[PDB]
Amino acid sequence: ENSVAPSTGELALEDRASLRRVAGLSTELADVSEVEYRQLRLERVVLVGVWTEGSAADAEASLAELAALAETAGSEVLEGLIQRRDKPDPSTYIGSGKAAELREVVLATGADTVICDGELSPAQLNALEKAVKVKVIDRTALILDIFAQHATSREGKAQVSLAQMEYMLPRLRGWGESMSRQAGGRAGGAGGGVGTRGPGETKIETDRRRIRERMAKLRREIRDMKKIRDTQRGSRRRSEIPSVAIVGYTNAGKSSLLNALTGAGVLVENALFATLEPTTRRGEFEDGRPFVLTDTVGFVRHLPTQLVEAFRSTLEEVVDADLLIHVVDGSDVNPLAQINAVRTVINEVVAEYDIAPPPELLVVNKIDAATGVGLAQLRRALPDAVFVSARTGDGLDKLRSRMGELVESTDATVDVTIPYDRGDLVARVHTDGHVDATEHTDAGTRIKARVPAPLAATLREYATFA
RNA sequence: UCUACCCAUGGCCAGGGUGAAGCGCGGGUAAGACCGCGUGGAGGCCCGAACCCACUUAGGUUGAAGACUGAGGGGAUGAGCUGUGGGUAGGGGUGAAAGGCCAAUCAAACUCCGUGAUAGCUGGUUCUCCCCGAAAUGCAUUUAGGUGCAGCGUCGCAUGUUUCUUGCCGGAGGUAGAGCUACUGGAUGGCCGAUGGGCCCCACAGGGUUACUGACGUCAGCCAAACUCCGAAUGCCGGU
RNA sequence: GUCAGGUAGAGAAUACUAAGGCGUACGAGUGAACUAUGGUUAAGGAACUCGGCAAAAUGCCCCCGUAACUUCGGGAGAAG
RNA sequence: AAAACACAGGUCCGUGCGAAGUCGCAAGACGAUGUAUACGGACUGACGCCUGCCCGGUGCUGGCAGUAAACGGCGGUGGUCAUCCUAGGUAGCGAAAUGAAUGGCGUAACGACUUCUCAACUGUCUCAACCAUAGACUCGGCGAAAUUGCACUACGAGUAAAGAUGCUCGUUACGCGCGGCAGGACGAAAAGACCCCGGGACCUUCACUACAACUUGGUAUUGGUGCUCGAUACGGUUUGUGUAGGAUAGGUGGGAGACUGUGAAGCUCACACGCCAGUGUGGGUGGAGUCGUUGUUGAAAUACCACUCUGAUCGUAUUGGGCCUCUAACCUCGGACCGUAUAUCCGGUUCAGGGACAGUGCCUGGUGGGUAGUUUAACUGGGGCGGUUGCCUCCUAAAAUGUAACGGAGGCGCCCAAAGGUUCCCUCAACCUGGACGGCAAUCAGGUGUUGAGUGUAAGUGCACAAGGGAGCUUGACUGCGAGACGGACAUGUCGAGCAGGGACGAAAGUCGGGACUAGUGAUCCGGCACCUCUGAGUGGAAGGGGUGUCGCUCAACGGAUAAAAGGUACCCCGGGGAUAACAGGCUGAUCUUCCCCAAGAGUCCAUAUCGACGGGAUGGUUUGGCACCUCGAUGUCGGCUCGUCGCAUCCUGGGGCUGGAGCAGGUCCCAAGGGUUGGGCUGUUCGCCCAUUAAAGCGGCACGCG
Ligand SMILES: Nc1nc2c(ncn2[C@@H]2O[C@H](COP(=O)(O)OP(=O)(O)CP(=O)(O)O)[C@@H](O)[C@H]2O)c(=O)[nH]1
């Protein structure tokens, strides 16, 4: 450019941001012992994203999410290139100044792997590939691959496959044929719910006709596994046991809490989304009533829009709850970015299924290893919260106390006396009603029990006034 | 003589509306523009018969008809329709251009001639009995549904068991099988245990001795079209 | 190509008729279904359907009254 | 019948006048009885809007001045080519009714155009009924046609060239008619238009080869004058370095005479040469002999020549090219007369213009789809796209040879003057030991080391006896041959003992006609080059031919159609094919569909109320497929309508078990096919979405039933 729209000194329209090959942390790197063959850790993925929003500090966690995605998905990151583009690029994504830079960046990797962050229309992916000719899958395809490798239940192996088909259907030509040509089991290779390839050799399939047919069958099957789930939850619904759910960002001790308060024993792997199918377990409020506890799947910033069906059961558990719990990973940078996304998910849930929002119990987790990011009322960034340490079980008592006190009691506290002949009633109050205490009176007892509705009218006749 | 276009010379277009220029009276206006009122009758104007077309629908669809009928439809003073007489002719004509039309036919008319065109393609090829009796393979092919040569039939002449079967004898294999501690590779479980780690007491030595891992071997149990230390049965080549 | 009666009518349209010319060359029956061409229809009124295709509707004369827009001519027989 | 063509309007290009353009071989014609405000061709298509930074000079019309992105540049930058003022239909201006500001927006009126909505109306429909006429039907008369192997021509389930009136086993059926329906006779009709193969046709082009047309030149018509550059012929003293030197000498053969007193040698000077070798020309007091083979230089003498040529460029004869003209050939559709009463024809005479130009002939190059004749491969699990095509090596290949696939892996189109021949000698790879660099690791020593290294090059077969590693000498990487065989359609391809001649190496025996072996290549024709004793169109020669050796092809589609060749056809046509595709049928069941088996787990505890991973086994024949068996001398497609009929894998209704069945209501499984299973708006929908109901708004087969 000699005199074309005078912009000398930039060639990228931005004084500071322009072409931003920061390589600040260089994402992250690995170490020895990944040296058996070349496919145990091969996709030395380079990352790229657009700073199109506020502080690059709050966007650093955004690319940390992608780095963690790659780490849990297997293949280890090798480089990261975050562009300070003012606004998202309309047709391409890289910046058109890095359209050549990308190749000389990726000559430093180990195997062909470049990853974008935002969801890319096929318009992007038609030339973003031609930029380097190396397979590029965005963050949504990475989430779909993670779930594909983590799917284990029949329901999940259909929801994940449907989500992948619904994501790949728009971007069939070009990109779709690109991973059709590339059949080695890459990061985009996914696998569907099989995980151990199977349809992984077909990846996300290629044919639009075949995709459409399998999509119709999967729609029908997911329809069936909702009138299965309603049956399975009927027993809880009919008994109206007080339900408590645990939501929040992934890796925030969401399953460790449910293995901590109650001795459930669910998988607690360190990687990202692993408890991909909701599981619920019984529990007793320390003082009185019993309850049920449910741990959900896991939320992410800018959640993929093809995974709402895979999250549908999670949403159902969220709606059918009394005390919602968003667990925040205390020992992590910016412990609020997770919170805003989780909350936003909550609003879209309460909107899609119109219901009175339930109280949201707040717990900060991993404060045992935290360096006190606030170390004050600053650490009380949300002043209402309980600082539990699931790795050590510190706030369990305080949590177990306040969670019940914040669930509300639908009991009926009465004072009743029972002549000894009808010890059946004494036993029924002592095993169903959660009696506080009493003194063992001459003929009866001064029982002060938070008796329920079935026995409320039972004990009305044998009442007392003292 | 149909149709396309052109030339010469003739004819036809019921009826009913609208109302251009111009002109006049004027006004209007400084005057002009213009505005009113009259006359006037223009227009590839309007509605609509004859006429010329052919938009829709139904019928016909071995028709009444090798392109029509019924009902509606478009133009109908015009780049109009039409009579009579002419002109342009085939790689040519004409074409408000459709590969349209040029005598019921047009991505090159018809007729006769070259001419009995040619067709690796299709069809057809007419009486009897007797004797023998296939092939659908190889090679080559502007070749793959054709053909050339070889193989297999038959007839004749020459030779005469040379053919074939069985027994015996002499042969070369690397198949079936099996084996791998005999090569090249895969691979299971131990034992031996280098080294690397092991890193602490604390030396930096030496020790403990590594969740360890692990050279090197070693034992056991396996695998292979393109592995063979091995290795048949049949078949094949000679002799008898 | 020539002629173009009468009444109704603007009309060479249409209907009925004068002059004149014809009954046009297979007939006779018969309430079959069905097909064609006509006719009518309760109550709804395009629900039919690819699609108001087809049919139905409007239609004449005289008085009034006539929109957006406009190339100032028209629209316009507006509509009513 | 239109959105296509045309159109008025516009823009560009060409044309100065029997014009350009077109028809004709030409003459001639139209253009036009016109004349740049006109005519021809090409694009666009009323009308409007969008839209130049402002005039110096590459230059232009020329008289300085236009001009606009006439050419830049939008740059300062007015401004709005106006003062000054810069060699991209362009981001000028970068201005969203909408990349077009020469291509996009608008646009009144108009349209048998396309797509929607409203009001009115209606048998279009709910959902039909009735009436008349013309057929149909009956009676009398006349009286066809396509079709046709047959015939006292059933149905089910099978079988069969895989869809049976004809076959098999059963079930049903008295003989002959009439009126109707349209499910079959793969009904009739048309030697399938789709698809493939072969032929053709017409079209296109930077396919090949030609031609027309245009055009560049040479020359003939075609001549004269001059200038004019010289391509021209014919002669010329002095000049001329080894020149031996009476001394810077062209010979030559005559050579002994010429120069002779107007002037010998010797000269002296101006000037050529200038290599002062010093010759000389010319000029000058100038003369009264130097001379010459004087043998002299191979050789004159500056004595001559007759030549030779050698001086060194002056005259000298014809001659090309250029320029200038001129008239006389030739040309004029410029005029005037005459034949000629008639005459824009034609010819003749004459004047006026051109004029050796043009036009035309023969020759010669260039452009040349304007036109023609033709080419444009085959294989192929249809064709196309993609790949391949010859040679070598493995596996397939079933222990001889051979053996296919669009089966599994690779290589080659060479390299080497030594990496060939011979003689002689040697042994590796790896391991251990210990030595400065030195390291697991360059070199050294010792020890193990029997083949695991190497072998130019792929792979295989081999080779430690070495074919592997060295050194010496050599060219057998020969000539004339080759008994006998291998492989073989043929053409090719191989091996070969041994003989003779001349060699190499080795003392000799003996080995040597390329390389451990198997790839490294191309027939024939045609034509080069060298040698030879062949032959030489009457003869002698030569030309040409012949023989021997050898050379020229990615003729790689590699047994090689021509030396030379790409496409389109939905405008297509013919000849064939179910040898081969699209629909349907048939086989398979990968895919699909419905279940089942084991039980990790989920389900508040809880494998099995409801679900069920990881794996396995099946049914069915509805999806997409795979195959290519029937049909290409025709088996008419999707959807909708009408009419159905059947299965159950049951949507509703009916009967049961379990339940995480308290009741109400559900979930799941079993039994159950009698009946029923709505009407609309959107969608090609094939699918589906939406609206209002319903007991419910089932899924499927029947050529995806039914033209
Ligand atoms: N140090 C520490 N680590 C914790 C604490 N709580 C949870 N973690 C860690 O978080 C990790 C993620 O395990 P998990 O409990 O599944 O977290 P999660 O949020 O449920 C991840 P998912 O959403 O996929 O189930 C575990 O490895 C666990 O060790 C804590 O209090 N301290």
JSON list of N, CA, C and O (backbone and C1' of nucleotides) in Angstrom, two decimals, chain A residues 152 157 210 214 217 227 232 235-236 238-239 280-282, chain D residues 591-593 602-605 609-610 612-613 662 664 668:
[
{"chain": "A", "resi": 152, "resn": "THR", "atom": "N", "xyz": [-20.78, -42.65, 27.54]},
{"chain": "A", "resi": 152, "resn": "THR", "atom": "CA", "xyz": [-20.81, -44.03, 27.99]},
{"chain": "A", "resi": 152, "resn": "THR", "atom": "C", "xyz": [-22.21, -44.61, 28.09]},
{"chain": "A", "resi": 152, "resn": "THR", "atom": "O", "xyz": [-22.35, -45.84, 28.04]},
{"chain": "A", "resi": 157, "resn": "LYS", "atom": "N", "xyz": [-24.85, -41.47, 24.03]},
{"chain": "A", "resi": 157, "resn": "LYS", "atom": "CA", "xyz": [-24.28, -41.80, 22.73]},
{"chain": "A", "resi": 157, "resn": "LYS", "atom": "C", "xyz": [-25.20, -41.43, 21.59]},
{"chain": "A", "resi": 157, "resn": "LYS", "atom": "O", "xyz": [-24.76, -41.41, 20.44]},
{"chain": "A", "resi": 210, "resn": "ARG", "atom": "N", "xyz": [-27.42, -39.50, 4.52]},
{"chain": "A", "resi": 210, "resn": "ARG", "atom": "CA", "xyz": [-27.21, -40.37, 5.66]},
{"chain": "A", "resi": 210, "resn": "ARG", "atom": "C", "xyz": [-27.33, -39.61, 6.97]},
{"chain": "A", "resi": 210, "resn": "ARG", "atom": "O", "xyz": [-27.93, -40.10, 7.94]},
{"chain": "A", "resi": 214, "resn": "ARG", "atom": "N", "xyz": [-30.06, -40.54, 9.93]},
{"chain": "A", "resi": 214, "resn": "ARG", "atom": "CA", "xyz": [-29.66, -40.80, 11.30]},
{"chain": "A", "resi": 214, "resn": "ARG", "atom": "C", "xyz": [-30.18, -39.73, 12.24]},
{"chain": "A", "resi": 214, "resn": "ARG", "atom": "O", "xyz": [-30.51, -40.02, 13.39]},
{"chain": "A", "resi": 217, "resn": "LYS", "atom": "N", "xyz": [-33.82, -40.63, 13.05]},
{"chain": "A", "resi": 217, "resn": "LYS", "atom": "CA", "xyz": [-33.85, -41.73, 14.01]},
{"chain": "A", "resi": 217, "resn": "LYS", "atom": "C", "xyz": [-33.45, -41.26, 15.40]},
{"chain": "A", "resi": 217, "resn": "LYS", "atom": "O", "xyz": [-34.06, -41.66, 16.40]},
{"chain": "A", "resi": 227, "resn": "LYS", "atom": "N", "xyz": [-39.82, -39.93, 27.92]},
{"chain": "A", "resi": 227, "resn": "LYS", "atom": "CA", "xyz": [-40.86, -40.72, 28.57]},
{"chain": "A", "resi": 227, "resn": "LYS", "atom": "C", "xyz": [-40.28, -41.93, 29.28]},
{"chain": "A", "resi": 227, "resn": "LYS", "atom": "O", "xyz": [-41.02, -42.66, 29.94]},
{"chain": "A", "resi": 232, "resn": "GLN", "atom": "N", "xyz": [-38.77, -42.74, 35.38]},
{"chain": "A", "resi": 232, "resn": "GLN", "atom": "CA", "xyz": [-37.75, -42.96, 36.40]},
{"chain": "A", "resi": 232, "resn": "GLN", "atom": "C", "xyz": [-37.80, -41.91, 37.50]},
{"chain": "A", "resi": 232, "resn": "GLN", "atom": "O", "xyz": [-37.41, -42.20, 38.62]},
{"chain": "A", "resi": 235, "resn": "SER", "atom": "N", "xyz": [-41.18, -41.58, 40.94]},
{"chain": "A", "resi": 235, "resn": "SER", "atom": "CA", "xyz": [-41.17, -41.95, 42.35]},
{"chain": "A", "resi": 235, "resn": "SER", "atom": "C", "xyz": [-40.76, -40.78, 43.23]},
{"chain": "A", "resi": 235, "resn": "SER", "atom": "O", "xyz": [-41.35, -40.55, 44.29]},
{"chain": "A", "resi": 236, "resn": "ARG", "atom": "N", "xyz": [-39.74, -40.03, 42.81]},
{"chain": "A", "resi": 236, "resn": "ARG", "atom": "CA", "xyz": [-39.37, -38.81, 43.52]},
{"chain": "A", "resi": 236, "resn": "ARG", "atom": "C", "xyz": [-40.47, -37.78, 43.44]},
{"chain": "A", "resi": 236, "resn": "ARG", "atom": "O", "xyz": [-40.80, -37.12, 44.43]},
{"chain": "A", "resi": 238, "resn": "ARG", "atom": "N", "xyz": [-43.76, -38.17, 42.97]},
{"chain": "A", "resi": 238, "resn": "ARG", "atom": "CA", "xyz": [-44.93, -38.53, 43.75]},
{"chain": "A", "resi": 238, "resn": "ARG", "atom": "C", "xyz": [-44.69, -38.32, 45.24]},
{"chain": "A", "resi": 238, "resn": "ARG", "atom": "O", "xyz": [-45.56, -37.83, 45.96]},
{"chain": "A", "resi": 239, "resn": "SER", "atom": "N", "xyz": [-43.51, -38.70, 45.72]},
{"chain": "A", "resi": 239, "resn": "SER", "atom": "CA", "xyz": [-43.18, -38.50, 47.12]},
{"chain": "A", "resi": 239, "resn": "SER", "atom": "C", "xyz": [-42.83, -37.06, 47.45]},
{"chain": "A", "resi": 239, "resn": "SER", "atom": "O", "xyz": [-42.85, -36.69, 48.62]},
{"chain": "A", "resi": 280, "resn": "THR", "atom": "N", "xyz": [-28.07, -38.79, 40.87]},
{"chain": "A", "resi": 280, "resn": "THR", "atom": "CA", "xyz": [-28.64, -38.29, 42.10]},
{"chain": "A", "resi": 280, "resn": "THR", "atom": "C", "xyz": [-28.48, -39.33, 43.20]},
{"chain": "A", "resi": 280, "resn": "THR", "atom": "O", "xyz": [-28.41, -40.53, 42.94]},
{"chain": "A", "resi": 281, "resn": "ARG", "atom": "N", "xyz": [-28.41, -38.85, 44.44]},
{"chain": "A", "resi": 281, "resn": "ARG", "atom": "CA", "xyz": [-28.19, -39.73, 45.58]},
{"chain": "A", "resi": 281, "resn": "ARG", "atom": "C", "xyz": [-28.96, -39.22, 46.78]},
{"chain": "A", "resi": 281, "resn": "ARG", "atom": "O", "xyz": [-29.19, -38.01, 46.91]},
{"chain": "A", "resi": 282, "resn": "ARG", "atom": "N", "xyz": [-29.33, -40.14, 47.66]},
{"chain": "A", "resi": 282, "resn": "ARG", "atom": "CA", "xyz": [-30.08, -39.77, 48.85]},
{"chain": "A", "resi": 282, "resn": "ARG", "atom": "C", "xyz": [-29.19, -38.99, 49.81]},
{"chain": "A", "resi": 282, "resn": "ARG", "atom": "O", "xyz": [-27.97, -38.92, 49.66]},
{"chain": "D", "resi": 591, "resn": "U", "atom": "P", "xyz": [-23.78, -52.79, 8.89]},
{"chain": "D", "resi": 591, "resn": "U", "atom": "O5'", "xyz": [-24.70, -51.71, 8.18]},
{"chain": "D", "resi": 591, "resn": "U", "atom": "C5'", "xyz": [-24.19, -50.44, 7.84]},
{"chain": "D", "resi": 591, "resn": "U", "atom": "C4'", "xyz": [-25.18, -49.64, 7.04]},
{"chain": "D", "resi": 591, "resn": "U", "atom": "C3'", "xyz": [-26.52, -49.38, 7.70]},
{"chain": "D", "resi": 591, "resn": "U", "atom": "O3'", "xyz": [-26.50, -48.30, 8.61]},
{"chain": "D", "resi": 591, "resn": "U", "atom": "C1'", "xyz": [-26.86, -50.10, 5.49]},
{"chain": "D", "resi": 592, "resn": "C", "atom": "P", "xyz": [-27.41, -48.34, 9.92]},
{"chain": "D", "resi": 592, "resn": "C", "atom": "O5'", "xyz": [-28.88, -48.58, 9.37]},
{"chain": "D", "resi": 592, "resn": "C", "atom": "C5'", "xyz": [-29.61, -47.53, 8.77]},
{"chain": "D", "resi": 592, "resn": "C", "atom": "C4'", "xyz": [-30.89, -48.02, 8.16]},
{"chain": "D", "resi": 592, "resn": "C", "atom": "C3'", "xyz": [-31.94, -48.52, 9.13]},
{"chain": "D", "resi": 592, "resn": "C", "atom": "O3'", "xyz": [-32.68, -47.46, 9.70]},
{"chain": "D", "resi": 592, "resn": "C", "atom": "C1'", "xyz": [-31.74, -50.02, 7.32]},
{"chain": "D", "resi": 593, "resn": "U", "atom": "P", "xyz": [-33.27, -47.62, 11.18]},
{"chain": "D", "resi": 593, "resn": "U", "atom": "O5'", "xyz": [-34.28, -48.83, 11.06]},
{"chain": "D", "resi": 593, "resn": "U", "atom": "C5'", "xyz": [-35.55, -48.65, 10.46]},
{"chain": "D", "resi": 593, "resn": "U", "atom": "C4'", "xyz": [-36.36, -49.91, 10.55]},
{"chain": "D", "resi": 593, "resn": "U", "atom": "C3'", "xyz": [-36.50, -50.49, 11.96]},
{"chain": "D", "resi": 593, "resn": "U", "atom": "O3'", "xyz": [-37.57, -49.90, 12.66]},
{"chain": "D", "resi": 593, "resn": "U", "atom": "C1'", "xyz": [-35.84, -52.19, 10.45]},
{"chain": "D", "resi": 602, "resn": "A", "atom": "P", "xyz": [-24.93, -46.76, 39.89]},
{"chain": "D", "resi": 602, "resn": "A", "atom": "O5'", "xyz": [-26.02, -46.09, 38.95]},
{"chain": "D", "resi": 602, "resn": "A", "atom": "C5'", "xyz": [-25.74, -44.85, 38.32]},
{"chain": "D", "resi": 602, "resn": "A", "atom": "C4'", "xyz": [-26.87, -44.41, 37.42]},
{"chain": "D", "resi": 602, "resn": "A", "atom": "C3'", "xyz": [-28.20, -44.16, 38.09]},
{"chain": "D", "resi": 602, "resn": "A", "atom": "O3'", "xyz": [-28.26, -42.90, 38.73]},
{"chain": "D", "resi": 602, "resn": "A", "atom": "C1'", "xyz": [-28.53, -45.40, 36.11]},
{"chain": "D", "resi": 603, "resn": "G", "atom": "P", "xyz": [-29.06, -42.74, 40.11]},
{"chain": "D", "resi": 603, "resn": "G", "atom": "O5'", "xyz": [-30.51, -43.30, 39.77]},
{"chain": "D", "resi": 603, "resn": "G", "atom": "C5'", "xyz": [-31.45, -42.51, 39.06]},
{"chain": "D", "resi": 603, "resn": "G", "atom": "C4'", "xyz": [-32.75, -43.25, 38.88]},
{"chain": "D", "resi": 603, "resn": "G", "atom": "C3'", "xyz": [-33.42, -43.73, 40.16]},
{"chain": "D", "resi": 603, "resn": "G", "atom": "O3'", "xyz": [-34.20, -42.72, 40.77]},
{"chain": "D", "resi": 603, "resn": "G", "atom": "C1'", "xyz": [-33.33, -45.51, 38.61]},
{"chain": "D", "resi": 604, "resn": "U", "atom": "P", "xyz": [-34.73, -42.89, 42.27]},
{"chain": "D", "resi": 604, "resn": "U", "atom": "O5'", "xyz": [-33.43, -43.18, 43.14]},
{"chain": "D", "resi": 604, "resn": "U", "atom": "C5'", "xyz": [-32.43, -42.19, 43.32]},
{"chain": "D", "resi": 604, "resn": "U", "atom": "C4'", "xyz": [-32.21, -41.86, 44.77]},
{"chain": "D", "resi": 604, "resn": "U", "atom": "C3'", "xyz": [-31.99, -43.06, 45.70]},
{"chain": "D", "resi": 604, "resn": "U", "atom": "O3'", "xyz": [-31.02, -42.74, 46.69]},
{"chain": "D", "resi": 604, "resn": "U", "atom": "C1'", "xyz": [-33.84, -41.80, 46.46]},
{"chain": "D", "resi": 605, "resn": "C", "atom": "P", "xyz": [-29.62, -43.52, 46.73]},
{"chain": "D", "resi": 605, "resn": "C", "atom": "O5'", "xyz": [-29.93, -44.89, 47.47]},
{"chain": "D", "resi": 605, "resn": "C", "atom": "C5'", "xyz": [-29.21, -46.07, 47.12]},
{"chain": "D", "resi": 605, "resn": "C", "atom": "C4'", "xyz": [-29.58, -47.24, 47.99]},
{"chain": "D", "resi": 605, "resn": "C", "atom": "C3'", "xyz": [-29.55, -48.59, 47.30]},
{"chain": "D", "resi": 605, "resn": "C", "atom": "O3'", "xyz": [-28.25, -49.16, 47.28]},
{"chain": "D", "resi": 605, "resn": "C", "atom": "C1'", "xyz": [-31.56, -48.37, 48.52]},
{"chain": "D", "resi": 609, "resn": "A", "atom": "P", "xyz": [-38.03, -55.09, 37.32]},
{"chain": "D", "resi": 609, "resn": "A", "atom": "O5'", "xyz": [-39.20, -54.18, 36.76]},
{"chain": "D", "resi": 609, "resn": "A", "atom": "C5'", "xyz": [-40.56, -54.51, 37.00]},
{"chain": "D", "resi": 609, "resn": "A", "atom": "C4'", "xyz": [-41.44, -53.31, 36.78]},
{"chain": "D", "resi": 609, "resn": "A", "atom": "C3'", "xyz": [-41.12, -52.48, 35.55]},
{"chain": "D", "resi": 609, "resn": "A", "atom": "O3'", "xyz": [-41.72, -52.98, 34.38]},
{"chain": "D", "resi": 609, "resn": "A", "atom": "C1'", "xyz": [-41.33, -51.07, 37.42]},
{"chain": "D", "resi": 610, "resn": "U", "atom": "P", "xyz": [-40.91, -52.94, 33.00]},
{"chain": "D", "resi": 610, "resn": "U", "atom": "O5'", "xyz": [-40.38, -51.45, 32.91]},
{"chain": "D", "resi": 610, "resn": "U", "atom": "C5'", "xyz": [-41.24, -50.38, 32.58]},
{"chain": "D", "resi": 610, "resn": "U", "atom": "C4'", "xyz": [-40.45, -49.10, 32.42]},
{"chain": "D", "resi": 610, "resn": "U", "atom": "C3'", "xyz": [-39.31, -49.17, 31.44]},
{"chain": "D", "resi": 610, "resn": "U", "atom": "O3'", "xyz": [-39.74, -48.97, 30.11]},
{"chain": "D", "resi": 610, "resn": "U", "atom": "C1'", "xyz": [-38.56, -48.19, 33.45]},
{"chain": "D", "resi": 612, "resn": "G", "atom": "P", "xyz": [-33.13, -49.87, 26.40]},
{"chain": "D", "resi": 612, "resn": "G", "atom": "O5'", "xyz": [-31.55, -49.94, 26.55]},
{"chain": "D", "resi": 612, "resn": "G", "atom": "C5'", "xyz": [-30.81, -48.76, 26.77]},
{"chain": "D", "resi": 612, "resn": "G", "atom": "C4'", "xyz": [-29.67, -48.99, 27.72]},
{"chain": "D", "resi": 612, "resn": "G", "atom": "C3'", "xyz": [-28.73, -50.13, 27.37]},
{"chain": "D", "resi": 612, "resn": "G", "atom": "O3'", "xyz": [-27.81, -49.74, 26.38]},
{"chain": "D", "resi": 612, "resn": "G", "atom": "C1'", "xyz": [-29.26, -50.21, 29.67]},
{"chain": "D", "resi": 613, "resn": "A", "atom": "P", "xyz": [-27.04, -50.82, 25.48]},
{"chain": "D", "resi": 613, "resn": "A", "atom": "O5'", "xyz": [-25.55, -50.25, 25.47]},
{"chain": "D", "resi": 613, "resn": "A", "atom": "C5'", "xyz": [-25.31, -48.86, 25.39]},
{"chain": "D", "resi": 613, "resn": "A", "atom": "C4'", "xyz": [-24.05, -48.48, 26.10]},
{"chain": "D", "resi": 613, "resn": "A", "atom": "C3'", "xyz": [-22.80, -49.20, 25.64]},
{"chain": "D", "resi": 613, "resn": "A", "atom": "O3'", "xyz": [-22.23, -48.59, 24.49]},
{"chain": "D", "resi": 613, "resn": "A", "atom": "C1'", "xyz": [-22.91, -49.27, 27.99]},
{"chain": "D", "resi": 662, "resn": "A", "atom": "P", "xyz": [-49.49, -45.80, 43.76]},
{"chain": "D", "resi": 662, "resn": "A", "atom": "O5'", "xyz": [-50.65, -45.93, 44.84]},
{"chain": "D", "resi": 662, "resn": "A", "atom": "C5'", "xyz": [-51.08, -47.19, 45.30]},
{"chain": "D", "resi": 662, "resn": "A", "atom": "C4'", "xyz": [-52.38, -47.11, 46.05]},
{"chain": "D", "resi": 662, "resn": "A", "atom": "C3'", "xyz": [-53.56, -46.56, 45.27]},
{"chain": "D", "resi": 662, "resn": "A", "atom": "O3'", "xyz": [-54.18, -47.54, 44.46]},
{"chain": "D", "resi": 662, "resn": "A", "atom": "C1'", "xyz": [-53.42, -45.45, 47.32]},
{"chain": "D", "resi": 664, "resn": "C", "atom": "P", "xyz": [-58.65, -45.10, 39.91]},
{"chain": "D", "resi": 664, "resn": "C", "atom": "O5'", "xyz": [-58.57, -43.57, 39.50]},
{"chain": "D", "resi": 664, "resn": "C", "atom": "C5'", "xyz": [-59.75, -42.79, 39.40]},
{"chain": "D", "resi": 664, "resn": "C", "atom": "C4'", "xyz": [-59.41, -41.40, 38.94]},
{"chain": "D", "resi": 664, "resn": "C", "atom": "C3'", "xyz": [-58.58, -41.33, 37.67]},
{"chain": "D", "resi": 664, "resn": "C", "atom": "O3'", "xyz": [-59.37, -41.44, 36.50]},
{"chain": "D", "resi": 664, "resn": "C", "atom": "C1'", "xyz": [-57.66, -39.91, 39.31]},
{"chain": "D", "resi": 668, "resn": "U", "atom": "P", "xyz": [-44.73, -47.09, 27.46]},
{"chain": "D", "resi": 668, "resn": "U", "atom": "O5'", "xyz": [-44.33, -48.59, 27.78]},
{"chain": "D", "resi": 668, "resn": "U", "atom": "C5'", "xyz": [-43.03, -48.90, 28.25]},
{"chain": "D", "resi": 668, "resn": "U", "atom": "C4'", "xyz": [-42.97, -50.30, 28.79]},
{"chain": "D", "resi": 668, "resn": "U", "atom": "C3'", "xyz": [-43.61, -51.37, 27.93]},
{"chain": "D", "resi": 668, "resn": "U", "atom": "O3'", "xyz": [-42.76, -51.81, 26.89]},
{"chain": "D", "resi": 668, "resn": "U", "atom": "C1'", "xyz": [-44.34, -51.63, 30.15]}
]
